[PDB]
């Protein structure tokens, strides 16, 4: 009957989600309310900076998107999806959007700042995580995808660069730029090459099963220290992905390999997360037998490691990036395209 | 070793999103 408690939880969560989805928060702060401190990461049309909110003194991570660059890259609807979905969701392993607003030049999303840095950084430095360590993070992704999928959302960009570690050692999922609310199938080609499911590559319609394939790639990369399909150029990576061959380090436990064979499954009628039992084939797999799902959700499980915290506003868990001054044009750019933002 | 092959490849830094 654990199954019925889950359904009840998800039912109320959908209620909450839909209210906000149908009536999105909009224009809830202004640039001059924040002191910009330092860039925490970048992307093709913007950057995320640490900022301090002047009226409260709280730090946040502010994503600043250049409207013109969004348009030139044809990401207008994806950016509208991002903001509309993020303002509507609520889960312990999802970064919160606290304010959003826009000006003549830019869009702005002010989110919680997660000072522990990216999983990417920690994983590359340590080499790989032990199985218990990877399982702890993996479990949080499983619960987060169960949450998001129940709301008809596909996430579509899972990777260590887009998972942050918070002060308690838990995961915060960021980067909703490709997230989409869709019943049935969708066709956009998007994600990150190492993580794309075969059906995205082969230009088929696809669905939330692509996020379960991506979890297979993530667990493999956490536990091996490299991904299951890598090469020097994306086309070589795609050929590996669609080949239907995968090999596992000799140190992977046989339960880990069995779980990954079922997630990294090219045949959709057989991919875990995608069968009649849904996420339950994953939650009940042997590799997760030690996992107490509720304890994980409640953040009662002791984390594998706690990031060094030097203080509020410290960024030493993040790489340094070149800074650039924000310029706000005296003319409104792209007003119609971003009207509902 | 596969690890050594990964470490010597040009895709151990942060990987950019792609799209059409
Ligand atoms: O810096 C980022 C970033 C920067 C620019 C874009 C853009 F392409 F502009 F849309 C997209 C993402 C992300 C990429 N992965 C992590 C990075 C990041 C780094 C820190 C935080 C944070 O502290 N809170 C919320 N999101 C965060 C996101």
CATH topology of domain A24-117+309-339: Phosphorylase Kinase; domain 1 (3.30.200)
B15 touches chain A (CB under 8 A): yes
Could you state, in order of their start, the residue ranges of all structural domains in chain A?
A: 6-23+118-308, 24-117+309-339
Q: How many CB atoms lie within 10 A of CB A203?
A: 9
Residue A217 near residue A230, CB atoms below 8 Å: no
Helix (H) or strand (E) holding A242: helix A234-243
Q: What's the CATH architecture for A6-23+118-308? A: Orthogonal Bundle (1.10)
Chain A partners of B20 at a C-beta cutoff of 8 Å?
74, 188-190
The residue whose CA is least distant from atom 8 of ligand 1 is A43
What DSSP designation does A338 have?
T
Inter-CA distances, A205 with A187, A223, A243, A306, Å: 5, 30, 19, 41
Backbone angles phi, psi at A26, to 5 degrees: -150, 140
Asked if residues A186 and A78 have their Cβ atoms less than 8 Å apart, the reply is: no
- Give the dihedral sign, CA A212/A6/A153/A204: positive
Residue whose C-alpha is closest to residue A188's, from A99, A286, A73: A73
Q: Structure solved using which method?
A: X-ray
Tell me which residue of A74, A101, A43, A99 sits closest to A337, measured CA to CA: A74
Give the nearest ligand 1 atom to A64 CA.
9
The verdict on whether residue A47 carries a ligand-binding annotation is: yes
Q: Is A47 in the pocket of ligand 1 (CB under 6 A)?
A: yes
Interhelix angle for A131-150 vs A209-224, to 10°?
A: 170
**Tokens of residue A81, six digits:** 């999806």
Tell me: is residue A48 an annotated ligand-binding position.
yes
Q: Rg of chain B's alpha carbons, rounded to an integer?
A: 11
Contacting residues for A232 by C-beta, under 8 A, at least 6 apart: B9, B10, B11
Q: How far apart, in whole angstroms, are the C-alpha atoms of residue A152 and residue A190?
A: 18
- What are the strands, taking DSSP E only, across chain A? 34-43, 46-53, 59-66, 97-102, 106-112, 153-154, 163-165, 171-173, 180-181, 190-191
Closest Cα to residue A85, out of A176, A158, A189?
Answer: A176
The verdict on a CB contact (< 8 Å) between B15 and A161 is yes
Cβ of A164 closer than 6 Å to ligand 1, yes or no, is yes
Residue in A57, A274, A251, A237 with CA at minimum distance from that of residue A149:
A274
CA A333 to chain centre: 29
| Distance, CA of A153 to CA of A181 (rounded, Å) | 4
Distance from CA of residue A219 to its chain's centroid?
A: 14
Is A228 assigned a ligand-binding role in the annotation? no
Q: Could you confirm whether A211 is annotated as catalytic?
A: no
């Amino acid at each position: 009957s654990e199954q019925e408690s889950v359904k009840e939880f998800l039912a109320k969560a959908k209620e909450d989600f839909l209210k906000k989805w149908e009536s999105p928060a909009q224009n809830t702060a202004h640039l001059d309310q924040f002191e910009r401190i330092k860039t925490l990461g970048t992307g093709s049309f913007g950057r995320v900076m640490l900022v301090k909110h002047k009226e409260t003194g709280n730090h946040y991570a502010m994503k600043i998107l250049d409207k013109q660059k969004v348009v030139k890259l044809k990401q207008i609807e994806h950016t509208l999806n991002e903001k509309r979905i993020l303002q509507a969701v609520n889960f312990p392993f999802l970064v919160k959007l606290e304010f959003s607003f826009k000006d003549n030049s830019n869009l702005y999303m002010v989110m919680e700042y997660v000072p522990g840095g990216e999983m990417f950084s920690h994983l590359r430095r340590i080499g790989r995580f032990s199985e218990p360590h990877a399982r702890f993070y993996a479990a949080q992704i499983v619960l987060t995808f169960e949450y998001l999928h129940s709301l008809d959302l596909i996430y579509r960009d899972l990777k260590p660069e887009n998972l942050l570690i918070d002060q308690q050692g838990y995961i915060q999922v960021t980067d909703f730029g490709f997230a989409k609310r869709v019943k049935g199938r969708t066709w956009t080609l998007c994600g990150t090459p190492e993580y794309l499911a075969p059906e995205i590559i082969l230009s088929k319609g696809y669905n939330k099963a692509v996020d379960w394939w991506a979890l297979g790639v993530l667990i493999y990369e956490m536990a091996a220290g490299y991904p299951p399909f890598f090469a020097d150029q994306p086309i070589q990576i795609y050929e590996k992905i669609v080949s239907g061959k995968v090999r596992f380090p000799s140190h992977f436990s046989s339960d880990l390999k069995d779980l990954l064979r079922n997630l990294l499954q090219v045949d959709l009628t057989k991919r875990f997360g995608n069968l009649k039992n849904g996420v339950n084939d994953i939650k009940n797999h042997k590799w997760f037998a030690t996992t107490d799902w509720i304890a994980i959700y409640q953040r009662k499980v002791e984390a594998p490691f706690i990031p060094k915290f030097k203080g509020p506003g410290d960024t030493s868990n993040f790489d340094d990036y070149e800074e650039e001054e924000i310029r706000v044009s005296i003319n409104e750019k792209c007003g119609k395209e971003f009207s509902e933002f | 070793t596969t690890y050594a092959d990964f470490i010597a490849s040009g895709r151990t830094g942060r990987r950019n999103a792609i799209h059409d």
